[model samples]
Target chain A: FPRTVMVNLNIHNRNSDYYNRSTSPWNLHRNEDPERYPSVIWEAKCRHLGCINADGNVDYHMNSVPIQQEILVLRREPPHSPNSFRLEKILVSVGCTCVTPIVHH
Target chain B: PRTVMVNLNIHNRNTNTNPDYYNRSTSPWNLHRNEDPERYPSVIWEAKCRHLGCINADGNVDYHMNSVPIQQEILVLRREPPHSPNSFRLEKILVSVGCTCVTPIVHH
Candidate 1:
């Protein structure tokens, strides 16, 4: 998978009330209640972003810092059991911030 | 080990102010590895890569720490208050069990 594939979520700058702290405290714990929670980092979104271009592969001369997010992942046990879904926690990148590259001596 | 270890103050179902989200602690999916909660108590343990970069035969390159999840049983609180008898449910939560150094195939 391309490194950039993770960032390609269905992002929309929405109001803070979308996933408010009072409603979803665990999800916003690390995020510190931003004015707007722009993206919905779900497994479904991960699938959508995964199979695009960047297949041949490429790299950048720069690096960036990733913002980690904890989201509820509901997986179907017994593989496609309609009524039997289990909720699990997974950490994923919400966004990335550009940073200066360093060369260690 | 190449990673730095830290003692983390855990805040989950057991430690939550209101821990009732499910009626029981067992799940049919066999998701809870730590079924015997009495024997296995939750504690704080975390690992971070000691060095920012790793040295290889080619040259020095930046690497990131990869983590694998350790399933832990916890009492999950309902999304909203007004706790019901069956409001607190026992479920498996993922905790970082270990960390390993992994270099990205594509350079950033």
Candidate 2:
């Protein structure tokens, strides 16, 4: 028989940048906040620009540097019926990225 | 020795903007004929690279005429039981983008 169950939910913001670089705090606004900056190496790229032209000579060219970001999500699940059930349906929203891992263990 | 089986299954199919009408240009069904002969076959190509630590790359291109869903699977077999009295542990699980492909449908 099914009985009434009381479930307590504790939601806390454990925000960390380990998934993305474009929107992660480290890349989005690193200059404003350095203490909360994540320590992850990101991919960098080099862009090349065409040579400039003067009246009689060339002005060489200009290049742009590239930067990347990384973000990660860490979740803890205990070995219990309710806890395990809740973890299966957890929804994580990160700007434009989202993932759902089904439990089969 | 105990045997444990882990199965990773991915299921995909060829979908299109008009379910009733089938477009030969962007459909996965037509990938073989439309692929460039110089490069790998456009139908289905799979490659594993060690430089990036076991990288599996597979993808396709759609001109927004149809949508193709490609499924992939990876299985891991271990001798240790998941719930053992002596020892049971998981080191790590890594998931990454395998390749770059185009999809026609907007998956909102």
Candidate 3:
């Protein structure tokens, strides 16, 4: 397997319409919405750029800053059924033992 | 670990806002990945960096054709607990990927 075969899903909402406030307010009894209507990261990314980003923020300087996104993943397929096969190590049953019959005899 | 990141995390935000950093769209690596989402492993970098030994004095941000943990796409692999190998039957896989590859769905 190639060493370049891994993905890093950064789970942080750097862009959230309701992610601001600096702390877990809902947990602190402020009812600020902890989950706050969470959503996908790419979807979240779109939301941020669509809402407020280096582009919408009107400040290109805001670029390069780490933008946390919700821990969202696209479930292509579970590992339960991947690809690859193991060679049959067991010997195939060759009839009985000393049996030699012609198929078209 | 760090070097891999330095290599793959190259993104010119100034140009491509929504860059497919993984280069999955065009690169053959992704095709290999699609060949077997479960077996072909994965990467989390946006793209491969080939800076050609160009870095600051302190030593940072430089590499060549380096891929990292850049997410090209999300592939769900049924992960077992702490330690163990996953089991995926070939028949089911062929079905999952479609009829392009199969070896009898039900074998007695």
Candidate 4:
């Protein structure tokens, strides 16, 4: 039988513009509302199995684990401006390894 | 079998100055150093290979084989001091590859 290990991680946007709209090339209109831009969100998961040593000794203390990450991009429209009319709404989804497992056997 | 013969031709450009002469010439000789007498004259090196011979087949069914020759040319450019008081630049180097013989077979 295998042991069940649990790990969880969460992140939040601390900046005023949740969608990273500040770095965008487009100009923000004064009359438009700032909340019109979308928000950024992400999630991650991790798992692991036990480990063993060279002298056939089972090291229950050491554990091998699998790490997984997932990100989601929301869709939203850009604020209206007198300069031009463009679809500025976008969603960015990304996933990557947070940590790697080490095996002795 | 008697022997298999192979031939290779190579051509190289010579831009090195001649040690025999005390002075060398400029790129556009007549135009550049017209007033100065010390920079009076210079020499440019050029060499070329002339056509060799032709190949022939039967009397009625024969084609003309042209001779290919290789040519080499060198030129010198003069500039100011510190940078280069007297310098020579390689202008052109060319090699000619002669055409090979090919036979066509007719099958029914």
Candidate that would win on TM-score: 1
Fold similarity of candidate 3's chain A to the true chain A, as a TM-score: 0.17
| TM-score per model over all chains | 0.26, 0.18, 0.18, 0.15
CAPRI quality of model 3: incorrect
Taken over the whole model, the C-alpha lDDT of each candidate is 0.25, 0.20, 0.19, 0.19
Q: Give the runs in model 4 whose Cα sits over 4 Å from its true position.
A: A1-105, B1-63, B72-108
lDDT of 4 by residue, B6-58 (tens): 11111121212210000110000111112322110133222221223222212
List clash counts for every candidate, in order.
7, 8, 18, 7
The weakest ten consecutive residues by lDDT in model 4 chain A span A18-27
Residues B23-104, model 1: lDDT tens digits = 1101001112333322112233332323343322234433332111212222222211132222222233334322222223
Clashing pairs in model 4, backbone N/Cα/C closer than 3 A: A47-A66, A48-A64, A48-A65, A49-A64, A73-A92, A76-A89, B25-B42
- Kindly state the number of residue pairs that clash in model 1: 7
The recovered share of true contacts, given per candidate in order, is 0.00, 0.00, 0.00, 0.00
Candidate 4 lDDT for residue A66: 17
Q: Under CAPRI classification, how is model 4 graded?
A: incorrect
Alpha-carbon RMSD to native, per candidate: 20.2, 19.1, 26.1, 36.7
* Chain A TM-score of prediction number 2: 0.16
lDDT of 2 by residue, A1-105 (tens): 112111222221211222221111112221221211111213222212211122322223321112111222111223222222111111111111111112386
Q: Global CA lDDT of candidate 4, please?
A: 0.19
| Model 4 / residue A69 / CA error / Å | 68
- Which runs in model 2 stand beyond 4 Å of their true positions? A1-86, A91-105, B1-88, B98-108
**Model 3's TM-score against the true structure:** 0.18
